[PDB]
Structures are given as C-alpha cells and as structure tokens.
Design a protein around this ligand. Sequence first.
Ligand SMILES: [Zn+2]
Lengths: 50, 50, 49, 49, 246, 380, 74
Amino acid sequence: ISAAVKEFFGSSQLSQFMDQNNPLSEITHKRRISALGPGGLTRERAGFEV
Amino acid sequence: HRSPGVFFDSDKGKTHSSGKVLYNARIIPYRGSWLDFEFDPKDNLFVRID
Amino acid sequence: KTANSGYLTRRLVDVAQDLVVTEDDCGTHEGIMMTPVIEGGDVKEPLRD
Amino acid sequence: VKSDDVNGRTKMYKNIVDGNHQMEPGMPESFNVLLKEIRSLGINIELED
Amino acid sequence: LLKFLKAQTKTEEFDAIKIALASPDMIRSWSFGEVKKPETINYRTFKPERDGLFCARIFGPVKDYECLCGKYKRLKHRGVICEKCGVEVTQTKVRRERMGHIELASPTAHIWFLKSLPSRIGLLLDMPLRDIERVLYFESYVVIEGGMTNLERQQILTEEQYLDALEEFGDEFDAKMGAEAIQALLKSMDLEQECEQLREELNETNSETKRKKLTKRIKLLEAFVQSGNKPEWMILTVLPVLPPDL
Amino acid sequence: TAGTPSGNGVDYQDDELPVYQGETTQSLQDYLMWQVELTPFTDTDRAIATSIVDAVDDTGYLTIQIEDIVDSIGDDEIGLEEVEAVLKRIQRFDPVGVAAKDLRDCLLIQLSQFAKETPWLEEARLIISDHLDLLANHDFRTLMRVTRLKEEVLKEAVNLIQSLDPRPGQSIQTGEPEYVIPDVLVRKVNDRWVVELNSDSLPRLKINQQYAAMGNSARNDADGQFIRSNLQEARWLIKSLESANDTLLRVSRCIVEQQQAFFEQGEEYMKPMVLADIAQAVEMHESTISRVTTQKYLHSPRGIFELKYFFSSHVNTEGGGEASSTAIRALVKKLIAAENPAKPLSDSKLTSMLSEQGIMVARRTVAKYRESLSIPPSNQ
Amino acid sequence: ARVTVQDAVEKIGNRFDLVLVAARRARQMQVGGKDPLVPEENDKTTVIALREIEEGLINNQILDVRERQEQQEQ
DNA sequence: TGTGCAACAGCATGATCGCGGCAAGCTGATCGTGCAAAAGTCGTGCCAGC
RNA sequence: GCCGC
DNA sequence: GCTGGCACGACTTTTGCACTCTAAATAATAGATCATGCTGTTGCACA
Ligand SMILES: [Zn+2]
C-alpha cells in the first residue's frame, strides 16, 4: 500500500515541482489541465483537431 | 480524458479510397477490456474485442 | 510543418551531396530553351531573370 | 582532432603551445567503435590498402 | 628491446573500405579467447571474473602495465604472460580492441538474413519465408535427399507426416527440425549448375510474372559466386563478443 | 526518518545509443604525462620520462629503484647519470617533490625552490633534512648540541620542516568514490536484539520479472503460449534470489545469537567463533557459509560493520577455557593507552599483567598484537 | 590588416588555391627559415602572406622555384 | 464448352517522421557443496640489539 | 517542463 | 640482564570441481503515409 502510494505521489507524470517564480505562476500550475498522462494521449499520437 | 461510455465514429469516410464511409461503435469502461463494432466495405458486422 | 521541411532538406542533401564541378568545359552542344513565364494573359518571370 | 582523435588532440595542443599551428590529423575513435560494432555482428568489414 | 612506438604505427594507410560475410574461421581469428561464464566480475574481490564477459586473461589487463595477482607489475615487463594468470602486461587500452568469441553448441540463424522482407536466405531457397520460420523453430520438418522415396528435396512434411514416413519409408528419409537442417541443405547446393539452369529456363520461357523473380534469383546467385562468400555462412555456429570497454 | 539527506548527483547519457557511455578522469600519472608532453624533451628523454612516470605511486613517490629504471631501458648511453637528470626535471613539476626516491628527497627538492632568503632555510636545508633525520624524528634534544645551535632556533626550524609538504602528489588526486556501505543487514536493539535483512528488492525484482516475462507470455498477441520461454525463467530468478537471501539471513542470525555478548555492554566480548561453530548451527558446510560472510556488512548502533571480524579463532590457551585475541587486542590497547607518562608497557610486563587478569598469553604474543597497530612507548 | 582579400584572389584567381599558397608562405614565415618580403606592421604571418600575394611578389610557382634554388644551394 | 493461365485488388508488414540549448531524474547482486587440495594464518618459540 | 527558431 | 623483530607445527580459511531445482494483467483508443510482397479472385484464350 505504501509502495503504491509513494510511487504515485513521488514518481508520476502528473506529479511535478510547482513553479515558484511568482504567486501567479504557482496559481496557474495549480489550475492546470493536461490531456497527457497514463490514461491520456501521447504527444505524437495527438492531431490537429485535438 | 475521455469519459467511459459508448461512442460512434466514422473515420472521416476516407479509408478505402472508394468514397465509402465506415461507421464504428466503441465501448469504454472505467477498467476492463474494450469492445468494438465495425463495418467493412462489404457491410458486414465485425467485432474487435480488446 | 518544421519536421516535414527538415526531412525534405535531409533527403535533398543526401541525394545531391555527390556533385562537384570537376571540369572546365565539356564542349557539348546540348541545351534547353528558355522563355518568359506567361500564364494566360499575365506574366510572372521575364526572360532576363 | 579537437573532437575524437585521442593522439591528435595532444599533438595539436603541444603544437599550439609551441606556436606551430599544424593539425597532423589521424582517425576518429568513433569509426573504430563502429567497425567493432559491425564486426560484432556476423559481418566482416575491413580497410583495404 | 625498447623505444617501441605502437601508438604511432596505429595509424596505417588505407583505402576502399570493403564489406563481406564472416566465416567461422574468420571470427575465430579475431577472437583473443572464449567466453564461458555469464559473470562479468565477482563481489568477493571486485576483480573481473575468470572466463567471463569482463575478463583479464582475454581482453587484456585492467590497470596499465600491471597484471592480475601482481606477479609482473611494471613497464619493464613487456608482452609477458604470467603463469598464475594469462593476463599480459600492456597499456590496458587493448580493452577496446580485443574481441573474444563464444561457441553456440548448435547452429543458429542470423536474424539479419532471415527476417527481412527481401530475405536473402528465403529468396535463395525460393521456398517461402513462412516455411523457413516454421522449420527454424522445430514446428515442422524439411526432408533432404531421399531420392529413392517419393519425398521431394524440399518437402515441408510435419510431425505426423514424419511419423508416417518413418513407418512407411523407414530409412532413406533424412529430415531435421532445427537450424542444422537449413545449413545442411544450404551446403549441399551447387550454385553454378543451379544458376545456369535458372538462366536456361529464364531465356526459354518468357512471362512478366516469373521474369522478375527469376532475374532476382540470378542476380543474388551471381553476387554470391562473384563475391567469394559461402551461403552456409548465413547460419552461425559461433558468436563474436564486443570488447568490454565499449 | 527525522531527517533525509538530499539525493546525490547522478547522470546518464541521453540521446545516445550506448546508454550511460562513460567519463574520463584525471589521475596523478595522467597529469604528470600531460606535463611531460609540454616540456622540451628528446626522444630518449621522453622514453625515460614515461618509464619513471609509470613507476610513480598514488602518493607520487617513486616505488621502483633508479638502477631498475636504467635496467628497464636496456639502452646504451642511458646510464644513471642522465636518468638522474630526467628524474630531477620530473621532480620539479607542478606537484613539487613528486617522483621522489624517499622522504629526504621530497624535503630537499621542496626546499630548493624558495626565496633563498628564508629566515631558517639553510638552517633546515641540510642540517635537519639531509642529516640527523632520525634525531628530528625523536625529541632531538641532543640535536641542538650536534648542530651547535640553541634549542630556540630549532623550535622554529622544525616548524619550517613541518611546513614543508609531507607527501606531495596526493593533492592533485581527486577521490570521487567514497566507498560508502549500504549495510545490507541492519540490526537493532530490542529486549533480545532482533536482526533484519534490508535491500533485498526480491519483491521488486519479482514484480518487474512478472511484468516483463510473464507479461509478454500473458500477452496473447503471440501465437501459442510462452509458458516455458520466460515464465519458467522468472521463477528460477526469484528462487535463486530468495535462496541467497534466506541463507544470508540464517547465517547472520547464527552470528548474532552467538556474538550477542559483543553488542551487549562492552564491545570486546568476542568469542573465538570458528567456521565450524556456525557450520554445525546451520547444519551446512563451513565453506558455503564462509564465502557468504566475506564482504557482507551489518549496520550496528555501536558494533563494527563486518561479519568476518566475529570469527577471531584465538583460543590463546587462556586460563579458564578460551578467549579471543581481538578482545585481548582491545584490552591491550586500552591498557597501554591508560598508563603513566613514562608508559613502560613492556612486552614482559604487559604479558604478566594480562596473565594476572587471567589471559595466559606468551610474552611475544602481546608484542605482535601491539605492533599490529601501535608502537612501543619507549619500552626498549 | 586586410578586411578583403579580393586583390589577392584576383592575383591568382581561384579563391581556393590562394588559401593554400598563403598557408605555405605562412608556414615558411612561422616555423622558420624565412623573412617577410614586405614591411611588417605588427600583424600576423597569415595577413603578411596575403599582402605579399597582393603585392605580386609571391605565387605558387615562385615557391616551387625558390625551393629548388635553396635545395640546390645545399 | 469445360479448362488452365496471367493480371489485379485486398491485406499485412516494414520504415520514417527538424535542429540547438537548460532543468530534474534515476537500475544488485543468486546457486550450492563437500572436499580435498591448497594456501594462509595464529600461538608459540628463536636470536640480535640496548 | 521550458527557451530560440 | 632487558627488549624487539624473525621462523615453525598445528589449525583455519579459501577455492575450483561440481551438479542444482501461474492466472493476471496490462494496453489498446488517437499519425499518417508510402512501398512491397503474398494470396485469393477474375478475365482471357485453348483442346
Ligand atoms: Zn599474474
């Protein structure tokens, strides 16, 4: 259980350092929506219409 | 990501270069195997499981 | 489009890299006719260019 | 030299310190690695004289 | 015996790189030894394990002009093979050059020449790549010779057909299910009579379908004949290994 | 963990087919050969320079003799007269004093390159370095009379001597590998001192081996079933790792239960544990257990990190039963350390004291123990 | 200091041969056994060779002949 | 008039998809065995220096 | 992930 | 007379030779785009 939890929280595609240059930059990172990830689509697999 | 459910597509109707539009149906669960229903240029039901 | 252009440049370079001016004059009389580019009633390229 | 020539690098450095400025180029080690890699397959590749 | 300059002579004049197939004898000629243990090094002493992937007896020394166990460790010794360990005193860069070879205790096929859309082995055989793949993995047999019996030279008889032939034909049936079968029938072919017979057929009968296949077969056969290679060298009974430093 | 150290810097070759490739490093001989290439030398001089640079140790000293260098060349007109000249030229390199024959040579070469107006250069140039070096090693009380100088000036002449570098050539040396230990077998203190085995990674290797081999086998894209190609190879790998882990754990358990006296109270309570003692405990040959305990390390709150240390087969014919020399060695170290300023610690007197304590050890046996890691405090 | 070598290029016109000729002359003046035939203005042997070529008193043929004369002298 | 041959459509597989630079980010090894053979070592007693 | 196209 | 590094007979350690012994579960979807070879289908000419 702890192994899976730490694996997800530490080493994952959607888990990354929050940009701390400015307060607004942190806010934008917090409110960010990604189409990639495990259940998402890869970059080259994307197309113009997506 | 894409919500689980049933979705119908037509692959834009340019696969066989004959102007034939091919319609397909797809079922996505939250977890499990997938289900496909397709139409060949000869108009016969085909099922692509997983 | 940047990739599609770089791949084309790679292919062109690889097909054309073995071309060097190795002679002064071959003396051949063959050639090509050159005329101005006139499309319908409008011209784009004069003979001088 | 200045990249993968192991002896060429040192020879060029010594020449520059001596104020000679002569390349004295040799063979890159990457091509030797490639020859070894290809020979490690079933293919025999050699340099003729 | 001093003032030797081996780094300078390492640059030798050359021209016109050539490429060819490697015979087993040619592969053994490169090899400085035989690798027999899949252990590169031991954590008991943190030294390259003997007769392993990373070894000092072959591939050369591991630390300058010193040799293993320290019997001969100086530049005063040159080209000395220690009795306790075959390690030779050397610069130790030789770890990038010496190759080494491993026996296969059974011939295997090169994926380079087997698995390619214009497969040189399959096109040379003329029999389909699917058939070769089935034979190469012991799914089916391919009989060879067998002139007395009704079996053909390149039959694709399966296991049940093999048992039936053994019950009926008994002797005179030579079929192997391994890569040794393909090597055996590759060795038995005579290139000159075969290519000439194909050329005689190609010119006798003309058709736009068979013409391309016949011409390709004549081309490949001449390539092998005009190159000095041997078709049995596609299958390999040995295997060279890379220098450890690479 | 109350506090966690930051991850150490690591790297791996990206956008390169032979992944991780490598990295060249500079050593003492590599940096000395670089200087040889950039100084004006002839062909024979360059050959001699390479010959004597190959013989330079990590400390930067010349391990091989000059006459042996002349022998190695085996060339006419390459006698020691010119070998010495090339040697001095090389000694005057960036790590000044490198490639020196002995300690006197280092100090003499280092003192040659000074202002020549140093307050006590000539006082210590030869008088202390090139002569009466053993006196300077000792208290050198009589050295003041020998050199016809007061003790006051010598008090700073030896200060300059110590200011000179002891072992030149190990400064350029890098030292990136710290040789740290992961301590495969952590043990803790409990009501009975339980022990555990860390860094096994057997479940981690099991999961990866599954997802790779059994994953490919379960993937039904390939025809048939790959139940023997890799499915019965991952099982062998897991069995091998688990067997090794169990053997190591059992052996370490036997060692811990036997040497619990070491961890409890004082450290020097080692029993002379022979290989057969644990061999009978695990009902297994000593050789297999020995190979196992050669480089395996345990993490102790106070104990030493090393399985082989516990063996100490040193019955020493001790008075009541048997004992261990390593414990006896620690006792001797503690006794010799806590003595009078005179500190006699005579091998006869020390042996007599040990025998009075109950350790019947020979007079010379204690001397070898002392000379192992110490020197007699004026016992002669 | 010569920003443009046009004159030197036109003295013997190929734009490739001059680079070599100047390299030969610069080796002569740099390695040893040669002195400039034009005044030296604290500039490097490369531009000295280029200026000598521009002045018309250095070309591949003269390098070949001067070499022959100095070989016959020894 | 039934039959054998050559040309063609559909499918499966392989190969390719720009160039530089900066971060942050990290993989293990296994037997085992008993056995003598060999090497190596420890407790002990020597003779030479102070 | 970002920068210059 | 006192002291400090060299050898010797048991014991101890190392080392090749030596043959070992399941159901789960993970991803597809979402790049096209082009070239080539293999196989089944069909039009054409023959006895
Ligand atoms: Zn050796």
